[PDB]
């Protein structure tokens, strides 16, 4: 309609600074298909991989702190907790393990997932984590009693990212069924099922200050306030690659990594793509490989960290692009 | 669902369904289907409304054309005209670039002009083209076409101007200048000629000489200017030119 387009044209987005590559830390001998940082501090960030390991990394130096070898198969995801000094990690060996960070050694392997487990999210407020695998089910664990407390049946296929919010919409799943769910853990049921994607929403992330949750199928990055479970915006992601990552920055600077490796940045809520970045790879590696598989920002937000399939981790420092809608 | 309804031959329900479908900003195809259905039904009251709705939902100039075509098929000439006006008005109204390509608007304008021509009164077409010009190349072309169809002198002049512009862009030059002069307005033509001269190895020299000669001729037709030209030539530095100057 003309009534909306005109309005869109009238409104302007804020000039977010562009992004330039800063650090590249070829250290893993495998994909680096998870990355995470400490809520409390931003000194280190760990990165689980197809190595089977996960390595810890000092941001400032870029130096490899230490390794951790508590899986058999490849690590798919990790989550350092704000409220406790535990690092949860999870691998396609079906193990959702829990590393003490006072001793850097596993403690509570949680057992229950029938098959390769894709993501963890620690609940920001509770002493409870949430994991989901190709199982097609998101189980919540009491961390003390290392048992699945509840489980969330709804989904009809493998479930990827499964973020935890502190409100009522306490889990924000995202499947290959292309539904992204909002659940009520307490009710033992769904509350609202965002079906707006076309394909496997293989990426989703909570906004820090804004109580919303960007989510990405093969192209269209939707983003939504999950209070009602209502759409907020659609991003200009029109011919970008298969969106692997979908991290959001503190300053409303949503990042999206592709299977292409084209690092695409967007103003959040606007839905305005305001940068593209061509990937890079090593002289030995192939041009098809290069692809940002996992990524996240620091708590401040000036450094984006992208794990790419070059067996690398690339950290990114910081005139905006013209609007032009449909 | 629609086909089932058709088979049944209960039509109100089908209509309702169609309406519902069309409220969900569906495909152009759906809209077209709906239109077809409406046509098939006896009434042509409501079809217009639906078309309007479609247009509103799909700001696309092809839609407008389609609507017009329906109008044409229908008996009323006034209605078609009104529709055209509305289309034009809508295009005008969004001055901001929230728009279908400038080719599509041009096309629409052309169509309107054609319609007008087919109708009794031609002034209207001319007016429309003037309006178009005021609010580019495509538009100009359309205007020219309209003129041809039909004022003729004016059209010719416009064409000449366009040609001159093209030549300038490319940059024959002398010829262009001459044409401009002819078109003139006279003052403007003269200015253009002067500019050309200013703009203006052996071949180049020859061209320059020719230009100078032309200028001299112009002056004659119209002494100080000639003197100035001579001075300029001298500075640049021919014998023939000097001789001519002396004679003058």
């Amino acid at each position: 309609i003309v009534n909306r387009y005109e309005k869109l044209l009238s409104q302007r987005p804020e000039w977010h600074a562009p992004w330039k590559l800063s650090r590249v830390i070829n250290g893993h001998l495998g994909w680096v298909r998870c990355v995470a940082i400490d809520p409390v501090d931003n000194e280190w960030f760990i990165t689980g991989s197809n190595d089977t390991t996960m390595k810890v990394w000092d941001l400032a130096t870029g130096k490899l702190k230490t390794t951790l070898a508590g899986h058999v198969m490849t690590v798919r995801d990790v989550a350092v907790s704000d409220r406790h000094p535990y690092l949860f990690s999870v691998s396609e060996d079906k193990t959702v393990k829990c590393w003490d960070l006072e001793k850097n050694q596993i403690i509570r392997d949680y057992y229950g997932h029938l098959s390769g487990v894709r993501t963890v999210s620690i609940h920001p407020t509770l002493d409870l984590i949430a994991t989901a695998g190709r199982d097609s089910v998101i189980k919540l664990w009491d961390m003390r009693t290392r048992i699945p407390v509840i489980t969330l049946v709804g989904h009809k296929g493998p479930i990827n990212q499964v973020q935890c919010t502190p409100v009522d919409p306490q889990v924000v799943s995202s499947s290959t069924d292309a539904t992204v769910r909002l659940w009520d853990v307490v009710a033992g049921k769904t509350m609202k099922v965002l079906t707006h994607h076309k394909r496997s929403v293989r990426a989703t992330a909570l906004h820090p200050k804004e109580f919303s949750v960007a989510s990405a199928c093969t192209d269209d990055i939707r983003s939504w306030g999950l209070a009602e479970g209502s759409l907020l915006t659609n991003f200009e992601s029109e011919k970008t690659g298969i969106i692997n990552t979908l991290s959001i920055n503190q300053d409303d600077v949503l990042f999206a990594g592709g299977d292409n490796g084209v690092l695409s940045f967007y103003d959040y809520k606007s839905g305005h793509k305001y940068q593209s970045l061509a990937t890079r790879e090593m002289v030995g590696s192939l041009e098809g490989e290069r692809s940002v598989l996992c990524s996240t920002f620091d708590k401040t937000g000036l450094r984006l960290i992208t794990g790419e399939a070059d067996k690398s981790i690339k950290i990114w420092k910081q005139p905006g692009l013209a609007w032009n809608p449909n | 669902y629609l086909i089932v309804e058709e088979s049944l031959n209960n039509v109100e329900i089908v209509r309702s369904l169609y309406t519902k479908w069309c409220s969900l900003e569906p495909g152009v195809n759906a809209w077209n289907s709906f239109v077809d259905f409406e046509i098939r039904q006896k009434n042509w009251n409501g079809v217009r409304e639906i078309y309007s709705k479609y247009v509103m939902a799909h700001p696309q100039m092809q839609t407008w054309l389609k609507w017009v075509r329906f109008e044409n098929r229908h008996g009323n000439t006034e209605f078609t005209r009104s529709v055209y006006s509305l289309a034009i008005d809508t295009v005008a109204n969004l001055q901001n670039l929230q728009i279908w390509s400038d080719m599509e608007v041009a096309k629409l304008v052309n169509s309107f002009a054609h319609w007008e021509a087919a109708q009794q009164e031609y002034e209207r077409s001319s007016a429309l083209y003037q309006i178009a010009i005021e609010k580019n190349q495509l538009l100009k072309a359309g205007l020219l076409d309209f003129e041809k169809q039909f004022n003729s002198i004016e059209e010719t002049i416009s064409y000449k101007r366009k040609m001159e512009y093209e030549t300038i862009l490319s940059n024959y030059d002398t010829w262009w200048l001459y044409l401009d002069l002819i078109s003139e307005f006279p003052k403007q033509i003269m200015q253009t000629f002067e500019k050309a001269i200013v703009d203006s190895k052996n071949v180049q020299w020859k061209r320059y000489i020719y230009l100078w000669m032309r200028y001299i001729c112009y002056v004659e037709l119209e002494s100080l200017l000639e003197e100035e030209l001579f001075q300029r030539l001298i500075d640049d530095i021919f014998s023939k030119i000097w001789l001519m100057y002396a004679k003058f």
Binding site: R4, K7, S212 | -
Partner: peptide, 24 residues
């Protein structure tokens, strides 16, 4: 009518696209 009730237009519409200062 029932069908219409079942699926509404505002679902397809993003809410932020109209109002930017609006924040959840």
């Amino acid at each position: 009518d029932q069908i219409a009730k079942n699926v509404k237009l505002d679902d397809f519409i993003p809410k932020r696209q109209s109002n930017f200062e609006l924040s959840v």
